[PDB]
Amino acid sequence: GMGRRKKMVERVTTLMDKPEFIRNIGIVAHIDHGKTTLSDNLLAGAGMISLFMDFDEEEQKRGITIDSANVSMVHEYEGKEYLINLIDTPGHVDFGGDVTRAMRAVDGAVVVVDAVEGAMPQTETVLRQALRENVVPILFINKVDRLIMELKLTPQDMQIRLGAVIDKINKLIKGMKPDSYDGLRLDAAVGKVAFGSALNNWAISVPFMKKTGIGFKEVIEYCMEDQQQKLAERCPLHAVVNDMVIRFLPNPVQAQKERIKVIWHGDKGSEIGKSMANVDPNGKVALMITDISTDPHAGEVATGRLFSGTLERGKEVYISGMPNPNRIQQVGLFMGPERIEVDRITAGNIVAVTGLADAIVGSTASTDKAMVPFESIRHVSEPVVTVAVEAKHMKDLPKLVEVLRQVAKEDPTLKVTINQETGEHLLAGMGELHLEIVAHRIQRDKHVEITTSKPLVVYRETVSAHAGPVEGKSPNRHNRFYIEIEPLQPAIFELVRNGEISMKQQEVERRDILMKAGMSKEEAKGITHISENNIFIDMTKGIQYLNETMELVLEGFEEVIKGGPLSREPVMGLKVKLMDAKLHEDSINRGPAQVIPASRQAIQAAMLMAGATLLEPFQKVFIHVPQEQMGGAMREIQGRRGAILDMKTEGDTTIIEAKAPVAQLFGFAGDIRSATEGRAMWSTEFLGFEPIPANMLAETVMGIRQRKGLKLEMPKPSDFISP
Template sequence: MPNFTLEQIRECMDHVDKIRNMSVIAHVDHGKSTLTDSLIATAGIISMGAAGNARYTDTRQDEKDRGITIKSTGVSLYYEYGLNDDAKVGHLINLIDSPGHVDFSSEVTAALRVTDGALVVVDCCEGVCVQTETVLRQALSERVVPVLMMNKVDRVISELQCSGEEAYKIFEKTIGQVNELIHTFQDKRMPDLTVDPTKGTCTFGAGLQGWAFTVTHFARIYAKKYGGEVSYWTKNLWGNHFFNKTKNCWTNKSANEDGTTNERGFALYIMDPILDMFRYVLTDNKKKYGKLLDKLDIKLTVDDEAESGKKLLKAIMQKFLPAAQALLEMIVLHLPSPVVAQKYRAENLYMGPADDECCKAIKECNKDGPLVVYISKMVPTVDRSRFYAFGRVFSGTVATGQKVNIMGPNYVYGKKYDYFTKNIQRTVLMMGARVEQVDDIPCGNTVGLVGVDQYIVKTGTITTIDDCYPIRPMKFSVSPVVRVAIEVKNPKDLPKLQEGMKRLEKSDPCVLCIMDEETGQNIIAGVGELHLEICLKDLKEDFCNNAVDFTISEPVVQYRETVTAPTERQIMAKSANKHNRLYFEGAQISEEVLKAIEEQEITNDQDSKVRARMLADQFGWDVEEARKIWNFGPEGVTIMRNILLEATKGVQYLHESKEHINSGFQMVCRSGVLCGEELTGACFKLKDATLHGDALHRGAGQLMPCARAAMYGCLLVSQPRLLEPIYLVEILAPEGCMGGIYQVMAKRRGQVISEDPREGQPLADIKCHLPVGESFGFDPDLRAQTSGQAFPQCVFSHYALIDSDPLDANSYAGKIVVAIRKRKGLKEGIPQIADYEDRL
């Protein structure tokens, strides 16, 4: 039975300074779900004995079977917390446990958007891994405050057989790596967010055994026992502070003049008692561990005393250093409440002006202000028929039956597209696999909404006022670059499949379900092999109820098209009625400008004069041309990497034709000339135009195909190239496996970019770049070549140029183009200028 009631949670929701919204983030298998169990057990939802093994936040059967988290899971917990027993105050912790596998990084992004703090879990033995860096970078870009949990300290003691001093060096090195990442990626307008054991922002422990401690916890124990200020003990229990037993004083020197050594404060006062407890219990020395238990005033139950070995050790350590107590101290004291966090997060979240009514309400975390809710993901109900819209109330109060405006991800301020007005049927609290209904939820809290799932595909903003800008869309660290095509065996089942695909697309923040009308293909795109496997399993079992038989194609990769040179001449295209002519030039967009677009320094909704000045001053563009940027493309994606600008002089009727030409541009951006893949890094300049005087003869049917043909012509004479997606692969392997790793990489066009031996261990960290197209079957191949000793982790890194001419059918890129065109049902062969000569 939980130690709290729903009424206590609801009451605490009104005290914004007593709320903490936090995510648990880490590399795969570093122990997030296991650690979370300690907090769940302390709240009374599961027993202390089950903590570490129950994995309460792994709610799906396949999560339990695979032993990894697949979907982020929210749970609201209530605690009475206070450092002194007589001053305990109720705190509400809205906790989200997120996945660590790179294929599910989008779930981490969705969790971070609705939380203000992040518990970063690091396995002390493995240290900072590639996904630790990814999730920490995401947290810092969202202005989420990190605290650190050094997990699996029991492995350092039992497996590595470390002394107190050796353990300290491992901890210090890992904390240094984390702080280096924080220093590199944190927003410079934020205060210093680096973690420090002396400040209490770093915890050490073992989630599986349910124990943890902070340096400040031990400082309080010793201050009470020996006297002195807590700050004095905290300072001496970390860093280069050694205890001279001869003189009975502290020093900063590890050795004395007479040759005797001094012991480090952390090793002597913190690690040694823990090491003694481990040694005595695991060697079954009842006399010695009995004395320690008496000293520490630990009382074992009859059931505990009957145990031995690791089970007894877990029971003792849970009583000696309860993990939840250390974690709660860190969460309550060092993570910000919504009223603090929203002051500095508002400008990053809200797309409108800072003096807007909604922005002010978000900054103040005003529960009486206009309602602003951001929905970060859709959570399927138990029967998978409907969805809870899961998100965060940033201002106002959301209530059952309330009439609200829903803005989808494609909504543009002032327009009515992707905009709905509906009633909320129910407001619920997410409690892991369960939900609890509440009447209303004020700002500063996470929330689940029922009845809006028909209008929100993945994310959206919900408000009660008409004059509200949406919350900024999330930027994912991964891209859905691996695709499969699905065909139903029985054509009658096609509507069921497509309905299932729509529901699958809702359920996952990063999956793309494309029903291509031109080619008749049903395509599902995922981040990697595992992500696709899970999505296809969900589609078949949950969203199609095992009622649809379908076949799945081999996975293929999403390439991109680009240009590498400017056109040497103007390309002219005629409309079908021969009454209109458009003259275009094409050019590539430089890497520097593309980077500025990706970092959203240059955007479509910027003031044109400000943008033009930046492009002219920083990137050498012609200021007159830069002022006449018409649009960016393709629309509907977070980062639009192509530009259409108008560089004509004295052309009549151009303004009336702008929309039609832009529509042609958007078609080109979505489907490039080589093989219908997305275009990136191309700039089209409209240099001249001859337009018919009668609007009837220069309508969309005439100008859209004309503009498209001209831009395709520009692409074909601008040295077009294909871009392929690249994984960054991090491999942990013994040094004797290097030959096998290099062999596998060479066979798959991979490049080893770094090789770092691990200090004190016969292991090395190898980082490589591997084309996504060559990654299928990579894991088993690598394990076969290294006798199962190498452990790879792939994370999407970037798109790289394929350095061969795609217009040559015998080149590597040309063969890819031919294969993609065949798969998509496009006209066979490599496209040539002659294919468009009836228009050019």
């Protein structure tokens, strides 16, 4: 009934124009805590369908969510209908990029937590990703049936266990956002927490129990008596959870002004800032592109969040960084399960658009070319595992290049390196599963048979000392650049890594952040380029033509950051300082082909003078094992160059927290299973890049150079600079 496609078309299209009645939400959780069962049962309970959501063949075969999925529901609350745009997100750490992209589109998050496992490593990760986006969280504690049936827990004890979960989530919130904790605090008594069984279609909350005249003792009886279906009639999952969504997650009128504080360095008082804050359909277009996907019938689809304005077929918008207007072909919304085309979409909605040929993940699409773009969408960690990929058949060579480029466009937590001169392309990602799924879907969906090499790690290059000034010279000798280099301080690197500083911020705003983190006032005032992991500082004054030349100097800097001089691995942790410069007065002698090499070579040589070295990625590993198998678990992790960071005993089980190099964790799944007779449960989180041992530098570098087909000799500064 309510979910009839044409009755939902009319109901959604009516609600679409009423931002008060919209809720843009993501469902987020540690792996297997029940996101998709919840999403599926909300859709079913709400009438939108008759697990549906895991559409991909591999998601059903593996019982894992691989891609974010967009659906919507219409839900009545206090005699009014509301449009709930829902994004179900992957739990596995390898697909975390989908969580980060989903979080940019939504204003509220249902954090799902398993009552049995409690808060887990990615519970913290997704909560942090929500709070960094100014997304409001509520809590659904799931699998309460198991808590009741497998632990036979009494009304008072089950309560104590559920309360501990709530307190833990609140502690995480308070630690992440101390200044907004009071507003964000989860209170079971008002109803910001619900508890239930997504699998069995029931849920309760403290206020709902105090009104249904139902107690927790009755819930235990329903489960013990194998009458959970009768419980689902009295305490419907969709009614309790969707009510909580409407009552506690924000509409776009409430949320957009909060979202733009963190996703946009523009002025909230500018014309576009006010239109976005007011969710104005008659403002100019401001569209945040969060996802690129490929449709069988429609072609490429750009999904995103429309903050201001109205979109319709034929309307033209600029794409940030690109010169020409792109023309919308179709616009669509998610209506229950289905992405349906509509005549026009308005601010406040999550939208799907075709025709934006230049759009990428993170693009700003706008009516005015000059609009300040939204911030990039940055994932919590970067690629650490790589394989070589090659077509099995010479007729598929050009197609494989298009396929790999499209794969990385659709998931920028992958990094593709095309080689059209050998065909041995490189694919880097977050983990082995990440790359296994990509390879499978190339063969299945794109019909290109491929080989992949054994996985290897991706290192990072950095420096470990100060060097300079070092002079780089243009090929015509007319232009000179004098560079000093040193490692970033940890607190500064964190600001850069977290995007807390930006060249888009007011100079005063940015410099105060840097100085409070320990940077001197001249370096803070001189910062001119903040890359993803490195900074460039201009210490000069009065050098004529330098401002117009600085973009070329920074291009040379970016070229080095893509692959450092030790082994062509990505560079991180650099503070590069321009101390002096000499420029020819005529622009014909200081164009890109003159200035870019001069900047690049000075930085390359300075790195080799500054104790250049390699960093290797480490994972944090969390191993939950019964006491009987703790010896095998400890031995397995310590045999892989692992170090134990913590051991916590809870009952007759131990939670081991350890760290180990990614390069030492291949085959861990099978080895930890046999070492513990299948009893270990384990998860991971990326820890960071750490310095390789000093007496392994030459051999590590030579091995990388060998793998890449580079010169079999250690680089030296004279390879880059000459008299």
